[PDB]
Structure formats: structure tokens, C-alpha cells
Amino acid sequence: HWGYGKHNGPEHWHKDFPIAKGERQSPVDIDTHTAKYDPSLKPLSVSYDQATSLRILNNGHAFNVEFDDSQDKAVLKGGPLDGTYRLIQFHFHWGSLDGQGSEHTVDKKKYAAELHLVHWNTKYGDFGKAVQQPDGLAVLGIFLKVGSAKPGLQKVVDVLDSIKTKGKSADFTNFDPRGLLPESLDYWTYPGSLTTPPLLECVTWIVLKEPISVSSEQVLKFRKLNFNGEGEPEELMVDNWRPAQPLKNRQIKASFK
Numbered sequence: 001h002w003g004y005g006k007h008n009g010p011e012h013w014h015k016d017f018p019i020a021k022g023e024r025q026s027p028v029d030i031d032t033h034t035a036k037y038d039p040s041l042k043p044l045s046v047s048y049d050q051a052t053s054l055r056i057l058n059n060g061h062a063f064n065v066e067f068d069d070s071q072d073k074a075v076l077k078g079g080p081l082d083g084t085y086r087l088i089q090f091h092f093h094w095g096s097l098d099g100q101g102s103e104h105t106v107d108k109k110k111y112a113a114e115l116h117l118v119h120w121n122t123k124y125g126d127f128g129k130a131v132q133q134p135d136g137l138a139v140l141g142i143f144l145k146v147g148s149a150k151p152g153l154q155k156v157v158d159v160l161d162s163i164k165t166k167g168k169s170a171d172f173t174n175f176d177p178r179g180l181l182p183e184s185l186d187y188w189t190y191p192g193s194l195t196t197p198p199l200l201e202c203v204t205w206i207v208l209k210e211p212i213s214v215s216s217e218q219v220l221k222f223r224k225l226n227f228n229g230e231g232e233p234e235e236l237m238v239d240n241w242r243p244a245q246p247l248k249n250r251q252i253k254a255s256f257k
């Protein structure tokens, strides 16, 4: 039922998922002056050299690229994390215009889009068990601004015409997610939640300070996707972001300054 429109969007999600009004909901505005530099935070370790992508799917909310996570390959650790987290999928959130689209904001600034690389804690054995845990997931968030093209994105962009509508999927092998990272791994971190139903409070968020640049043409291709299925009226997949939620009790920590 849920989606991103007037009658089913963010302001409605609490009826099916009352945690929507919980104490550790995401995204949030990152007030960069209030974030605490934490000298005890470790550099983030991103090891994606053996990542194995499997498919790409239009799920009617966004598109996912899912990875084979049955071996110890693409892993996030260090930073604020205890233990090892395995990459399972990435997706994006983006706007109808370049001035909105991100879920997190930085001093109220919205970016054109936001990339989420979703990892589960290997101590829980699989992602379905990990989402039931308060430290089950680590999501790496990367802002996108419009400027110069991101060459590492173009393989994604060029397959989107094959998954235009809800339910469509394709083969999507040998995609290297290292091509979506910025130069710097400096980050903010805080405890939060999934930003889509079921909104589980299971995520350690790690948001990189440095955005990647993508071209205007690359993001225009995201905006040609459809929310609807094949043979329903066409509704462009745009503005699939949840707005910032109350920070409540929480402290955002910075790895830098």
C-alpha cells in the first residue's frame, strides 16, 4: 500500500508502521556545527574488490542492485562498527528536480540524490535476522550532486530502460561498486532506521561528507523510471525520499575535524 504520494507517502506510514514515530528514525538533518568530532572513531574500511553483483530490479519504490552475499567478500568494517558487515544491495533516492532528492540533509541542504549501500552484520547470519537487531545493518550513504558525469555509474544508467516499470528485473553481473565512491571516506555516523517501511530501528548510519558528482543526463535517466507496473497509468519514479525526521535523544559523530 505504502509509497511516496499524497495518500500513501511518508506522512501516512505510521498507520501501518507505528515505529515511524519512534526514537531512532532516519533520515535526519546533519547539523555539521553540532556534530561531535570523535577522535576514537576509526577510519572506515570498505573492501569491495571481490563484490559480485547479481541482478537489478525495479521494486516500484526504487531500483535495487542485489549482490551475492553468501561469502565473505564485499565488507564494511571499522569506522563506528564492531565486527563485519556484508554488502547485500544498493539503491538510490532522488528528486523530480536537482534541488531535492536526498534523504539526509547537511545544514538543511538537500542533494539531488542519495546512494545507500546496505550491509548486514555477519554475527546474525543473514539479512532477515539482522534487521531484527539494533546493530543489524550498516548503511553507507553517499550524496549525489549534479555536475560532471560519474563514469562508474554509467553501467547502471544504461540498464534502466530494461527495468522501466515495477516488477521488472534483469541480469546485472560484474558491476563494481568502488566506482560509486568519492575520494574521501570522512563521515558522520548516528544510530537510526530503515528509511522505508517497515522502518526498523536496526541501522548504524555512516554518511560520507564528500558527495559524488553525476551528470544532468545521468539523473534524468533515473527520472524516466516508473512507480507503476507495465500496463497501469504512467507515474514517473521521482521524489522517492523520506524527509528528515526528529533527532530526539541522539548524537551525530564526525570522523573528521
Ligand SMILES: NS(=O)(=O)c1c(F)c(F)c(S(=O)(=O)CCO)c(N[C@H](c2ccccc2)[C@@H](O)c2ccccc2)c1F
Binding pocket: 059, 061, 062, 063, 064, 088, 089, 091, 116, 118, 120, 127, 128, 131, 137, 139, 193, 194, 195, 196, 197, 198
Ligand atoms: N533506505 S534504506 O536503506 O533504509 C532501504 C530503502 F530505501 C529501500 F528502497 C529498500 S528497497 O529494497 O530498494 C525497496 C523498499 O523495500 C531497502 N531494502 C531493505 C533491505 C534490503 C537488504 C537488507 C536489509 C533491508 C528491504 O528489502 C527489507 C526491509 C525489511 C526486511 C527485509 C528487507 C532499504 F533497506
Ligand SMILES: [Zn+2]
Binding pocket: 091, 092, 093, 116, 195
Ligand atoms: Zn535508502
